[PDB]
Amino acid sequence: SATYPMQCSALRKNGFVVIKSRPCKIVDMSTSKTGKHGHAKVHLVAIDIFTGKKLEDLSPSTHNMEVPVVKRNEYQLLDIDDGFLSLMNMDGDTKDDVKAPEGELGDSLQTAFDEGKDLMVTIISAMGEEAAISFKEAARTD
Amino acid sequence: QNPMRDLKIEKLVLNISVGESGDRLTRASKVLEQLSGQTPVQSKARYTVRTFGIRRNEKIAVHVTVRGPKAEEILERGLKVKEYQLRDRNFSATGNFGFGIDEHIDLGIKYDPSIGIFGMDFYVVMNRPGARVTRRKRCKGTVGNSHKTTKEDTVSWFKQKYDADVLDK
Amino acid sequence: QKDAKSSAYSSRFQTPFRRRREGKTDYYQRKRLVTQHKAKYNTPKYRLVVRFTNKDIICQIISSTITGDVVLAAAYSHELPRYGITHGLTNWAAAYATGLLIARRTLQKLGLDETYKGVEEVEGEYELTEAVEDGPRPFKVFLDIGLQRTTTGARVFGALKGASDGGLYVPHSENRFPGWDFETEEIDPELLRSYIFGGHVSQYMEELADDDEERFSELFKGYLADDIDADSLEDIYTSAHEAIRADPAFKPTEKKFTKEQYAAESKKYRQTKLSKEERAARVAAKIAALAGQQ
Amino acid sequence: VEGLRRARYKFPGQQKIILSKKWGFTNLDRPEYLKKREAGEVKDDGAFVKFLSKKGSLENNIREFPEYFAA
Amino acid sequence: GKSHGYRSRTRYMFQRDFRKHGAVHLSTYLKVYKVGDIVDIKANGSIQKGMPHKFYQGKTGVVYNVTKSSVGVIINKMVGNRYLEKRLNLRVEHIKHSKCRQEFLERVKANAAKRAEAKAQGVAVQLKRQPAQPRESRIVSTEGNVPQTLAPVPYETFI
RNA sequence: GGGCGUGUGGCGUAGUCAGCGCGCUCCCUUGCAUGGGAGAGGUCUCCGGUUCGAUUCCGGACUCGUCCGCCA
RNA sequence: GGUUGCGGCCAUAUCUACCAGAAAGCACCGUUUCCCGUCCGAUCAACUGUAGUUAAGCUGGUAAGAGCCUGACCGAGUAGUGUAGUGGGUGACCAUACGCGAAACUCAGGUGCUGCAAUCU
RNA sequence: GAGAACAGAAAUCUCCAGUAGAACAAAAGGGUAAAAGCCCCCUUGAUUUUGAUUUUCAGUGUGAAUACAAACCAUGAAAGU
RNA sequence: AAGCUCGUAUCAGUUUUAUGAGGUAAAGCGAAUGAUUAGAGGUUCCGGGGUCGAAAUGACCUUGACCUAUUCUCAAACUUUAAAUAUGUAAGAAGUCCUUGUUACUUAAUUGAACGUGGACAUUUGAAUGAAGAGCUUUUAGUGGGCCAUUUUUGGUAAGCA
């Protein structure tokens, strides 16, 4: 399956959750007892990985929250044209479906490709939507 | 006494460890192939060692096994490279002996600028007739104590044949 | 000092079976051979045991009991001089002739020989002894090649081919016979027939006698001593085959002596054990010798 | 005996002080060990003593324990 | 949690033994079982197929079915307050014939032989077994066996 | 008392069974702005186990920062 | 009685170090055209039984041998244990009655037996 | 353990000893030496049809497993699996 | 509770005989695994500290490892060995033996497998003791909080504790 359930108390920091059908990454967790007799409630503060928005939800601790599958994958650039990166996989596979980043990451990547470094791109998959998060340079195998 | 106790060369094995796969490996394999007259066998690496830079299974060494009078001839060429002087440490307790040499130019192949220079390890395995008892599949047995090769017999044979002298150390 | 085994090692050691220690029996193969379908209650399972020593081929028909194995009939290659084969007693055709002899002998002593005549006119084709209707089934037997390597061209399969043409029903495929092409999965019958009639040794006889004569005097010396040339071995194989199909009756030798006559000499030659009292006298003399201050 | 009697106060329960009939830390009696050590069939170790047996190889039994066989 | 698997608590039960590991000898494959034979069940840990459960270890039953490599055995199992009938398919490495049955058959044939030979005379055959009777009168002599007087031994440390 | 997290070169940290950036120190290049290249620098908190190999997998220990310890 | 082929029980058969082996049989041994397999006719395949050798394998013997096996009234009726008492003892535990009964240790002996077929001075 | 250039504690090769002290996906326990381990070759029986039996047990279900029958296959020289 | 089919048995909280199975108690560690005390003899291309040494793959002591023969003490999740008490089966008539019928199974084969026909063996008919009747079926009540004593035993310092 694309996504799998988990418990709120089983969740912990720097893990992925589904909040309002968005892949989110937790920055804050806090548990407070509801009433003296009652079970504690978990208040979760998380950041969407793709959009960067801050989303929070509180739930019972025993409640089950949905968790996405996030895969980070490593590729080499071939060209940046029309806002669409062209990447090259190990064993020689090529994809052009990735859109170029639109922020300061995209600006730095564009300048780095213009001045000619060999750039290593990390793109993540979660719940059927695809994006690029970071780039490095290959220190060896020039 | 001595009807068929005569020592003989079971085999000569020539080992080259280039240490890393590729063009060298092929050049060392070509040198071994032209020296032996047989195609050599490359040997994989058992474990990954960082310090050597090796990883598991890249065929890091190449070796060949030659038997008979041809092996005797290459051993003659190796001994005249070594000037018929060998250390006492070279011989083993079982009776087998080996030595290591640098370059095939001393062996007389002559030099090609592409192929480079590779040294070799020569190892001679000595046995008496009747060694098939250990090797055969049916009725496999162990060789008797008197008939076993030993260090004193192999140094006596190496002094008598090849008219060589062993070093005291 | 180096080759030393502790008492703990020698006490915890478990020896294998005696035949495994001698290296003569593969018990993994033996279990799969001699075991029976338990609903066939006391039905024996019969092995054509073919063994190759130097200067002999041994063929036996053996079933298994708890007290030991039982032989119906045996046929060795050294009784082939009775049928006219004197040289090459371990070649591929000698294995064929030994298989034919043990097949004809077993069908004669079972009384299954007037039916199931086998392949009378041999040509090298691959076929099995099929069951005739409204009568008894053919005698079923399975090979025991032992530790010997299965190999296309090995002479255990020559013994199989001889036994199969003799009228035994032995299950086999044809892909281990000489002449089997690997790429085209078919059997070449004329090369197999040449091997049955000794073509591979006669062709060598010609192609070595024409050039290298000292080898032709070293080996094949008995062929010159008995004036056997290259082409006559085919018809002496044919005459040997028809002599086997005449009488496999196995007259044994006359033994030249008696069992106790051999036993007297061998009992005289064998060494005996030392008893307890003379062992004690020996150790007392040893104590008086070395420990008695010389 | 007085040292063991002083040590007995540090232990719970009841303990007894018994003078053994054995020679030292061995397991033979005093006259048995005396009639064994008059022959050469004992040989000292670092603190203990090794004994001769009638079993084993005679060569080892003669390189060890020579005075008993010096009869 | 608790654990009750199929081979739970079978450690020493399904160990092989000391110094008789390895392959099994061919007498177990050459032995012949018929329907109605009485067999003992002892599992062989070297053979994992056709294994009995740990309950039937050391149990004795009756053959009711013979197949290619196995034997069907009937055991009576106490379940609650009655015995139930259990049918087991076991490979022949895990069974052997019960020797008590063949001893009883030897008693039957020797007993019939005694009855047959003594029927020619009518000498009150007395074919039932009898247990250990009390031993009867005897006279013990002291010729070379004069009695030796014994006494209790006093106490010693012995350490 | 219990639970959770925490230690990576000075800092930020990332990680596959030790990488850069900014620091540091040199060298080189060219402003309006610079940039580049070298090095010295890390027992991945510590100690074990596992594993071909462990930052990574596990166990134990230390430090620090948190959160609970309530009804009578 | 020796040896070979196939075995059964699977050390009384194994291991260590020496010694011996008539005859026959195994074995080492000689060869690379053919079938076949290898880096390497070393193993495996094939051919000859010829050129040779009991040196080895194998078999047997030796050893106050290691191990293993058997037995003992050897330890020891000991340890342990089923049953009994309004038995002892603060207790820990221990005696007794009616029964069952070890292991280590010590000592003595032993070191393959045998089935089917073939063959042998 | 004893040897062989670079090559050493650990690279590859050779011999000897080696009852398993290794390995068999994982927890632990069993089992395994001409193998159940390592390497190579060929394959899809990890197939079809419904019954019976064992464990848990009410002798219900579920899961897992055992031995067959009727086909159709794989592999091997074959017994067989 | 209602009975039903039979009339001393296709029984038994028992013993004996024969034959299995087990890994606890005990024992063992100069037996495997693991723990563990002390010396002794050796090994240094093969350790570390000192002292003598130009230094030395030097020397002399000492201390650590490894090996060899010993020595002291142990194991719920160690074991070669291995009880007592409990525990499976058998002690016949539904048995044994002789002869020969069936089959589409099985065998090279009337070879075997299973079930049979006909015939022989009877009150010591196959050990002891006792049987109070033996076997079978339907239907339904209450119950499904337990506790104590001896012996074995777990957690706990212990408990009229769990």
How would you describe this structure to a colleague?
This is part of a larger assembly, with chains A (142 residues), B (169 residues), C (294 residues), D (71 residues) and E (159 residues). With 142 residues, chain A is mainly β. Chain A contains one helix and eleven strands. Chain A has one helix at 104-115, and strands at residues 3-7, 16-19, 22-33, 40-48, 54-60, 64-68, 71-81, 84-88, 94-95, 119-126, 129-137. In chain A, the strands form three sheets. Chain A has a five-stranded antiparallel sheet, with helices on one face. Chain A has a four-stranded antiparallel sheet with strand order 2-3-4-5, with no helix packed on it. A two-stranded antiparallel ribbon of chain A has the order 1-6. In chain A, a hairpin with a 5-residue loop joins strand 8 (84-88) and strand 9 (94-95). Chain D is 34% helix and 8% strand. A two-stranded antiparallel sheet of chain D has the order 1-2. Chain E has 159 residues and is of the alpha+beta class. Chain E has helices spanning 27-30, 99-118, and strands at residues 38-41, 60-66, 70-79, 82-91, 95-97. Chain E has a five-stranded antiparallel sheet with strand order 4-3-2-1-5, with no helix packed on it. The two termini of chain E are 51 Å apart. The interface between C and E is medium-sized, with 20 and 21 residues. Chain C binds four RNA strands through helix 1, helix 2, helix 3, strand 1 and strand 2. Chain A: It comes from Saccharomyces cerevisiae (strain ATCC 204508 / S288c) (Baker's yeast). Chain A: One of its GO terms (cellular component) is perinuclear region of cytoplasm.
Please sum up the structure shown.
The structure is cut from a larger assembly and holds chains A (142 residues), B (169 residues), C (294 residues), D (71 residues) and E (159 residues). With 294 residues, chain C is of the alpha+beta class.
Please tally the β strands of chain D and state the result: 2
Distance between the termini of chain A: 39 Å
In sequence order, what are the helices and strands of chain D, one letter per element? HHEEHH
Strand order, sheet with most strands of chain A = 9-8-7-10-11
Determine Rg of chain D (CA atoms, Å).
18 Å
Shape annotation of chain D: elongated
Helix content of chain D: 25-40%
How is the main sheet of chain A built? 5 strands, antiparallel
- Which assembly state applies to the chains in this document? part of a larger assembly
Helix content of chain A: under 10%
Strands of the widest sheet of chain D, in order across it, are 1-2
Task: List the secondary-structure elements of chain A in sequence, H or E.
Answer: EEEEEEEEEHEE
Structural class of the helix and strand makeup of chain D? alpha+beta
Percent strand of chain A = over 45%
PDB class: translation
Keywords: ribosome-associated quality control, nemf, Listerin, CAT tailing, translation
Entry title: Yeast RQC complex in state G
Chain A: Eukaryotic translation initiation factor 5A-1
